[PDB]
Design a protein that fits this description.
Two copies of one chain form a homodimer. With 433 residues, chain A is mainly beta. Helix content of chain A is 6%, strand content 46%. Chain A is built from five helices and 32 strands. In chain A, strands 11, 12, 13, 14, 15, 16, 17, 18, 19, 20, 21 and 22 form a twelve-stranded mixed β-sheet that branches. A five-stranded mixed β-sheet of chain A has the order 1-5-10-9-7. The complex binds chloride ion and copper (II) ion (7 copies). Chain A: This is Multicopper oxidase.
């Protein structure tokens, strides 16, 4: 049996940012396991020929540990992180965040996973055996070599490759014994969107029980047939695989654009060869329910538009000359109406420093509304605590954010996680007052 | 006295393409000296994390040694160059040329000079003493670190830095003894255009005697007050510097555009010359090897440079990344090319691989350009020599003559703009010899 997953490291002391990815204590892009409540002390050394900085995607830390892109260190310098892990048990990321340089550093290998473990958060699964992170990325190979050469048009729409990888393996295969499997689905692409489905060889769709998203577990498992996974989103599902052949596929949908491997076309991401009797892992009781959203006291609207050549949020974009520019000043519990233009495309928007409760999807496309599970158009992934939510053209997504006074005087980026859009400047500072 | 110039190597055996530039036999981006007629045998090793290929800018070699961008080698692989040097004595370049990746590799340090020497081509000057290459580039520094982070719009117009370097030195100073100096002006920027003038501290413009351009010497020296130098253009001038302070400046002009930290047409100092004491005088008048007379064209071929929405195009075509061997234009024999730039455009340093070009005529030039011409066909002093990279202004027509020799038929040669943002965007086509 073979299950290719990233290697493990228990805590990280020393990470080198290299052109081929993160070299943490000698291993390349390992999954860092942290216990909730523990102290993290990690030192980043820049081994690149350009600035960089590590962002702990989805972590509840102050902006010095975020780290804000203005703290990017030059080639040869170092940056010391020191913070407490207060995030719920979930699957998080660590990736570069220097402005205008993030996409290529990310695309060329600087990406790793962080797993926060809480009391009984494993649910009886074991990493690399039946707890399998599946980081789905896409690269453009030219002469069998991954290349990142976006055109001006690709810098507006996003850089899409011609082949899809799982944990850096093209046409990945998993040889497993029959049993219960916890798959941590992670979109590690620059811009590519997936509609993930698991089907039998004959075509029967295998149901997936969604148990966790970006910021931890749901209240209870939710059965899904397919789920959209936008860049930097996380979705932990449990599947029951008996002896047979299973395909993790991208099911056909409408990529509302404006390609070698069309985004909304059907193709196989990974193949599962299941043979023999393995272990059954009972799953029903989830360890910690997500907290109830707080009552917002202010409504704030956000407009996502393409202003000529520059993606904008409320007509604003990143100010490269003054990275500390305070685009939006916030305070307390706010309700954000994020509204995407019809003359736009999909935006996986992401907010640093603070998790988000998803409240409502209105004017969603038919393919999305067909997957909702409540009277507010919320997808199964919306029913958990999130930090990266996908917004479709013409769609409005309402979220609730609690800007605590504990982080006042700090800046937190709010940007689209389409790395071409972010590098292009679709990023603003959220200043906590 | 101090004159910071690139180091020398006489011929190059082994060159490594690294993220910080070319490591050739242990030195970083050295000036390679070759004798005209000699055999070059050099091996390129890719030490990057992405494909690349070395282009011998302005060399008359077959497309395997050019090398055509389709021959880019992957990380770890090697490429052997082997050719005879048949180019006239001049100042040439070697820089990356993989499609879509050239601008950043170039910008981040992969650029060097090649000097071809013929009989008496030194004119009595000595490299690093009074024969000084001035490679003028510009970089955007953020926190004292050069970065290449173009926005979508910057990939349309070109990546302009906020500081100008001479041989990789910011606010470069040259401490020289008074005498004759041969300055080899080379534009090593990705997109920035310069109008170069040498002025005294009081403001007096020091005349420059142009002696050579891209493809070798002129018929005779030409005195100039200022000259435009577009990316990858070369202009060798001779100046007489007495004791005093001189400034190599960018003179104000209209950058016909459509970050503004350092406006392209604004005035600023590129290098400072502190001249003190008496050095050597070098008499210069008889220039070796006269440029050949242009051959008579038998076909006229028109080229339109336009911005088709988001894609810069040459005759409405752009580079086909899916088929790098795509034959955009098929040529044969001696052709006269009418390269016409749109009014709704910007400056294009146009460049053709494999074959030199005779400049024949400039019409509809802007006033600032027409004021510098030296003949009744609007030709600038730099047009009066054999070229391989010619600047074309919006609304201007430049007619050139190219002799598509029978020696290279069955081969492909790129024809692209040397604005590296424009080239990366796809402003490049294959010229197929029949
Ligand atoms: Cl609209
Ligand atoms: Cu992220
Ligand atoms: Cu976006
Ligand atoms: Cu971010
Ligand atoms: Cu060149
Ligand atoms: Cu060339
Ligand atoms: Cu151009
Ligand atoms: Cu070229």
């Amino acid at each position: 049996t073979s299950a290719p997953v990233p290697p493990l490291i228990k805590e990280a002391t020393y990470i080198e940012a290299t052109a081929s990815g993160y070299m943490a204590e000698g291993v390349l892009n390992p999954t860092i396991i942290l216990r909730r409540g523990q102290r993290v002390d990690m030192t980043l050394k820049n081994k690149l020929t350009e600035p960089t900085i590590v962002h702990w995607h989805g972590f509840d830390v102050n902006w010095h540990n975020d780290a804000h892109p203005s703290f990017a260190i030059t080639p040869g310098e170092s940056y010391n992180y020191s913070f407490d892990v207060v995030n719920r048990a979930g699957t998080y990321l660590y990736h570069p965040h220097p402005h205008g340089l993030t996409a290529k550093q990310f695309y060329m290998g600087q990406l790793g996973l962080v797993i926060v473990e809480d009391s009984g958060s494993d649910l009886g699964f074991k990493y690399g055996v039946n707890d399998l992170p599946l980081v789905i990325s896409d690269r453009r190979f030219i002469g069998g070599a991954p290349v990142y050469n976006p055109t001006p048009m690709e810098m507006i729409a996003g850089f899409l490759g011609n082949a899809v990888l799982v944990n850096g393996i093209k046409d990945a295969v998993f040889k497993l014994s029959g049993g219960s499997y916890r798959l941590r689905l992670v979109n590690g692409s620059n811009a590519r969107l997936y509609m993930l489905s698991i089907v039998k060889k004959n075509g029967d769709v295998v149901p997936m029980r969604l148990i966790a998203v970006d910021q931890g577990f749901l209240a209870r498992p939710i059965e899904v047939r397919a789920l959209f996974l936008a860049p930097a989103e996380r979705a932990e599902v449990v599947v029951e695989l008996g002896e047979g052949v299973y395909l993790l596929k991208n099911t056909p949908f409408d990529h509302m654009h404006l390609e070698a491997l069309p985004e909304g076309s059907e193709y196989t991401i990974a193949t599962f060869l299941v043979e023999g009797k393995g272990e059954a892992v009972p799953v029903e009781a989830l360890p910690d329910p997500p907290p109830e959203p707080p009552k917002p006291t202010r409504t704030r609207r956000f407009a996502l538009s393409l202003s000529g050549m520059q993606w904008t949020i409320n007509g604003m974009s990143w100010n490269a000359s003054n990275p500390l520019f305070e685009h939006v000043s916030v305070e307390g519990v706010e309700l954000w109406e994020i509204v995407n233009d019809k003359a736009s495309m999909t935006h996986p928007v992401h907010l640093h420093g603070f998790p988000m409760w998803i409240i409502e999807r209105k004017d969603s496309p038919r393919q999305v509304a067909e997957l909702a599970v409540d009277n507010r158009g919320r997808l199964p992934t919306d029913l958990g605590l999130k930090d990266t939510v996908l917004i479709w053209p013409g769609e409005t997504v309402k979220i609730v954010v609690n800007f605590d006074a504990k982080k006042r005087g700090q800046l937190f980026p709010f940007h689209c996680h389409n790395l071409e859009h972010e590098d292009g400047g679709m990023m603003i500072n959220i200043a906590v007052k």
